[PDB]
Design a protein around this ligand. Structure first.
Ligand SMILES: [Co+2]
Length: 223
């Protein structure tokens, strides 16, 4: 099973990604990890890429795409979940042409849908418990609202994380994600629009439901 996943920050994408890569035994391949294996490990492509990075430029797509394809072929040989690439329509199209050339096939594309302002609030509304940071508390997700000012699990103190409160940072990432001209949504639609012509199934997940709720709907559809 080769699966591409798309979703904004605030959509719970990583959580769902992990449930999918576990049931199904996939290699989870994300954009960051690809660069490490290659730049870090100095494959022929990684050495060429690092020249760009070290002067503050982006790696050209003509180097990025084959870097991705190498990692899918090595790390992802027994099945992969590709997460966080492509981000735009040019990448998306070049990735798909490159997969077709290697005769590598997509089986599923998953998009987690959530309106922008909802995603941003779910990020900002996170509260971390002083006693156990795994305890879920969010001022904007009803089912896990804090108990007054304290953790709804253990009563410990709650704080906000500065990165969650940085609206500029959040907005710049959403601006790319929710860009329907040529951003990540446009890249997801590129897959959506050809799915049944190319023998894969596109799956839209409702990002507003609980973790367990999304996971059930997703599992149901992966067979
Ligand atoms: Co707690």
């Amino acid at each position: 099973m080769n699966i591409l996943i798309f979703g904004p920050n605030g959509s719970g994408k990583g959580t769902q990604g992990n449930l999918v890569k576990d049931k199904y035994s996939l290699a989870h391949i994300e954009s960051g990890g690809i660069f490490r294996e290659h730049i870090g490990g100095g494959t022929e492509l990684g050495k060429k890429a690092k020249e760009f990075i070290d002067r503050g430029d982006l790696v050209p797509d003509d180097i990025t795409i084959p870097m991705v394809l190498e990692t899918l072929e090595s790390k992802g040989k027994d099945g992969w979940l590709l997460d966080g690439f492509p981000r735009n329509t040019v990448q998306a199209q070049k990735l798909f042409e490159a997969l077709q050339e290697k005769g590598m096939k997509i089986n599923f594309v998953i998009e987690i849908l959530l309106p922008r302002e909802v995603a941003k609030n779910r990020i900002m509304g996170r509260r971390i418990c002083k006693n156990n940071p795994n305890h879920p508390n969010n001022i904007f997700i009803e089912a896990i609202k804090p108990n007054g000012d304290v953790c709804r699990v253990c009563g410990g103190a709650l704080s906000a994380r500065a990165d969650d409160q940085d609206e500029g940072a959040i907005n710049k990432r959403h601006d790319i994600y929710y860009n329907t001209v040529d951003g990540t949504l446009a890249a997801a639609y590129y897959y959506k629009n050809m799915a049944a012509k190319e023998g894969f199934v596109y799956i839209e997940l409702d990002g507003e439901g609980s973790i367990d709720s999304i996971k059930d709907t997703l599992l149901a559809q992966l067979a």
